[PDB]
Symmetry: C2
């Protein structure tokens, strides 16, 4: 399915998308709703960054290229926030 594509850009947009979506779908089956959100949203953010990276490789529109840049920066930072929350949310408050 990822092997049927109109163009190099579409091949790259599709590459990894199924695995990312399967990762999202499985991750949100975590029963703790906040942990499901963090794990699902990290997976979503991974997919957003990948799509934005492909737009920077192949895009030829200045507005969409700039938006792709901005999405990458913001999504990376939110992944960092979510990972820190996942690592630290069970720590004892002293």
């Amino acid at each position: 399915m990822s092997d049927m594509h109109s163009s190099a850009s579409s091949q790259e947009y599709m590459a990894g998308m199924k695995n990312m979506h399967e990762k999202m779908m499985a991750a949100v089956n975590e029963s703790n709703p906040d942990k499901a959100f963090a794990k699902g949203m990290i997976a979503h953010h991974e997919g957003a960054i990948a799509m934005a990276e492909t737009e920077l490789k192949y895009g030829k529109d200045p507005e969409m290229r700039k938006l792709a840049q901005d999405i990458i920066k913001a999504q990376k930072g939110e992944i960092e926030q979510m990972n820190k929350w996942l690592d630290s949310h069970k720590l004892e408050h002293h």
Copy 2:
């Protein structure tokens, strides 16, 4: 197929989203593929964030969900305006 009411709601719509996004990115124009694919992906994030506001009990993740909804909605508006101009 799911552990909980919250997980059932998180999963709802995600399948049709993968198919929708695979189709969207098969536009030959790479910037249009990006805009259509990313609108769909933003819609997925908004749906997940809404479910986190409905079921979540952690203040930090609830605040992040609220911020994501606002930002993604704004970027959807930008991408739609760009699509209309491109047409």
